[PDB]
Design an enzyme around this catalytic site. Structure first.
Site, PDB file in Angstrom:
ATOM      1  N   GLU C 200      35.706  46.011  40.642  1.00  0.00           N
ATOM      2  CA  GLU C 200      37.084  45.335  40.547  1.00  0.00           C
ATOM      3  C   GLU C 200      37.357  44.431  39.860  1.00  0.00           C
ATOM      4  O   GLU C 200      38.452  43.395  40.204  1.00  0.00           O
ATOM      5  CB  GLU C 200      38.165  45.928  41.482  1.00  0.00           C
ATOM      6  CG  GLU C 200      39.401  45.923  41.237  1.00  0.00           C
ATOM      7  CD  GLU C 200      40.622  47.007  41.956  1.00  0.00           C
ATOM      8  OE1 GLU C 200      41.698  46.812  42.511  1.00  0.00           O
ATOM      9  OE2 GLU C 200      39.880  48.265  42.037  1.00  0.00           O
ATOM     10  N   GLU C 201      36.369  43.875  38.765  1.00  0.00           N
ATOM     11  CA  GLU C 201      36.733  42.628  38.574  1.00  0.00           C
ATOM     12  C   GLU C 201      36.114  42.595  36.799  1.00  0.00           C
ATOM     13  O   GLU C 201      36.513  41.589  35.754  1.00  0.00           O
ATOM     14  CB  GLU C 201      35.257  40.648  38.782  1.00  0.00           C
ATOM     15  CG  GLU C 201      35.672  41.303  40.434  1.00  0.00           C
ATOM     16  CD  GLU C 201      36.030  39.833  40.690  1.00  0.00           C
ATOM     17  OE1 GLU C 201      36.887  39.080  39.386  1.00  0.00           O
ATOM     18  OE2 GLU C 201      36.331  39.511  41.808  1.00  0.00           O
TER      19      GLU C 201
END
Lengths: 308, 312, 307
Positions: C200-201
């Site tokens: 989730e980056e």
């Protein structure tokens, strides 16, 4: 009464032109002013003045200074129309002297008036050419001073485009006088150096400049400013901590500040204090209260022990 | 083992904050460190330290210098949010300290931690106003030091953002201790001046003939962290040519790895021959690094120098 | 004592490098940490963890999530002088990493230390290398991961500051919460999943509500942040109103916020986002905001779905 008399002397001093390079007349005025006083007096090879008050301990000395020279200008060229062109003496913006009246001193010693224009001088003399101007006595090299518009207010402000740094010069003078009237004994031989650009007995231990700078924020013209750092670097920590303590002990209103636009060579602890001015190197102002607080610090200081 | 120890000393030194203007702790620490040693020591009015080792010839003197003060900042204003504003101590770019942790020291000598952000300090303390900051003892005038993030690498490098010139200070100290441990006699009385004020300043026995600054610079070229650096010129101008030729010969004689450099950064009024050497530092003033081997060559050159004759 | 232990764990996680793409070690460290717990633990094709706790209702599910991946970089080219050239992992600004210490992991597991200096930004390696060849000879290669030293510190004053955080704070919260539920043996009204993601980056079908625990960008580091919207748009209005009521109800100090730069676009679930208050996503938060966050996910977790 004291502070008011102090303020009168500022006005007297500011009212005599003394741009760097041409301070003779003001050093003389000062030589005579203290001439009856006890103080020993000594004129430099440069024409600066050192005023010495012997103290109990003459093996260790304290040095206080304040400068009498001021900004000004010099005639760098006489234009064919007869207006003058100028080279600046000192660090200002020309902007802050447009329209000021000014005076031109010749070699001979004769003076004329003028107005600064934009950088020109419109001289107050029916003269229309370079030869006409010369006839007057005026030459490249002549000193030009800006009329200081000095005014003392009933509400207690002193306003002028000087105060660079004649406030401090008056302070040192009133201090010297006070030692005498009151028979105070200084614990150390103390030299008061009245300098004439913006030399020191080998036994000098502490060096206090009395002078006044600009901040980069809010100034305070009601308290004494004690400088912790300027563009050459931090001032001696311990001695500055000492001055703050003096202020608190004696209930002198003070402010500790940094002057970003302001020796090292002599083994000597250095400090700097002065009254708060406002809008320095332009249109300048301070209030009697700052001057009183400053007078009081210098006295407290000059009477304390050297730092441990 | 010698050089590793030298590095230990750098690390200890770098770990004492001492930005120009606030160098008392570190100067006391040094006064102590040598206090049993034979070296005569002397504090001037300025709080700089002069360490003197007498030599055969006490009529002509040599002066070595290295400085302990570092960059830092000072509290210029306490903002109404409670965050602090700073005046800079030294010549660096603010960029090179964005997000550094720092330590704010109080008059009464109390200490707080913070972080530099873009230029202010977020003080690691639950305070939301000018007033509650002052409650902490924090006041305009206070010294702020940048945490040096010092580390010694198994491969022989030493790094911190901020080494300043404490590399050289350690070198002078170990040299003085070496003169004593190994019973060496200096040919001239030699002064080691641990200064506290970058210009700087000095006052020095009238019989000093040679003056060597031990210090490090940046090139405009790109540095060498493995050799000793011998300065041919900086902003002030070229260094004394002959004495500089002398230093190169010492390095060749002794097989010391060197580089002749120009430092386009960093004076005179004393009739004295000047020189400047030091270890090579990388990214100087910004995030600094040098290697074991450069320190060893520098130690070797300073020693060879101090044992040589004055230039004819 | 409870809250400072949560900060211990955060520091522990922050100290394991884990930039997006290279998170095996930390995932392992977590997978080990819970091995003795009462919770069902399921690894993943992408290598993420899902920890599930059965409740009373097992036909309607809840999911909380937090991520262990971080900003980092990867070796983009080895330069003729032997300095390394980097490609960004994540979405930060380069200036914010100048002079940072870093670490380089090789294909074979060797690590070297380094410093970032200046998109034309490089790594100075802490090794006597002068050329592409000498660097490769260390086993460094284009493709190697680079992590930045987090410089993490917990202060006598209660702050935790790093230059990472961003999301390991939340990870420790989910981790610690799961633990206390099996300590205190209370029963979740619903089967809830705790997803520990690793991408989730850069999830069950009966899930009804989706709570992300994460931090976005004049901040407040003493309160739980509840997100009303972010660059993706408004979060479920009903659900956010619930989380606020939940805070007031439980006397949790909260702020409602809009993360203008914060990034299941189309899985059919009710979405929420809360997290501890971060300063400057070089990052800091106070422990009080962690305590407030901890109390909020708990109450959330014990709450009922909305009609």
């Amino acid at each position: 009464h004291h502070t008011k008399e102090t303020m009168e002397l500022i006005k007297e001093l500011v009212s005599i032109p003394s741009p760097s390079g041409n301070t003779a007349k003001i050093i003389n005025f000062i030589e005579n002013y203290v001439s009856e006083w006890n103080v020993e007096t000594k004129r430099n090879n440069k024409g600066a003045l050192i005023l010495t008050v012997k103290g109990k301990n003459d093996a260790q000395h304290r040095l206080l200074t304040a400068h009498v020279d001021t900004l000004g200008a010099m005639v760098k060229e006489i234009k064919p129309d007869g207006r003058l062109s100028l080279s600046m003496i000192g660090g200002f913006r020309w902007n802050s002297v447009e329209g000021e009246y000014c005076e031109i001193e010749t070699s001979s010693g004769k003076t004329y008036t003028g107005t600064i224009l934009m950088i020109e001088v419109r001289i107050d003399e029916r003269v229309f050419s370079a030869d006409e101007v010369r006839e007057l006595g005026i030459e490249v090299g002549d000193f030009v001073s800006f009329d200081p518009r000095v005014q003392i207010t009933e509400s207690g402000y002193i306003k002028s485009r000087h105060l660079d740094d004649k406030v401090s010069v008056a302070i040192l003078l009133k201090l010297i006088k006070r030692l005498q009237d009151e028979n105070v004994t200084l614990p150390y031989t103390t030299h008061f150096l009245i300098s004439n650009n913006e030399n020191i007995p080998e036994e000098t231990v502490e060096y206090l400049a009395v002078d006044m700078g600009a901040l980069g924020d809010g100034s305070d013209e009601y308290t004494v400013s004690i400088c912790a750092k300027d563009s050459s670097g931090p001032y001696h920590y311990a001695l500055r901590k000492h001055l703050v303590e003096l202020a608190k002990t004696n209930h002198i209103e003070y402010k500790v500040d940094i002057y970003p636009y302001y020796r090292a060579g002599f083994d000597v602890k250095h400090a700097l204090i002065g009254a708060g001015i406002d809008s320095s190197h332009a249109f300048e102002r301070t209030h009697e209260s700052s001057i009183a607080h400053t007078e009081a610090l210098v006295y407290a200081y000059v009477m304390s022990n050297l730092i441990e």
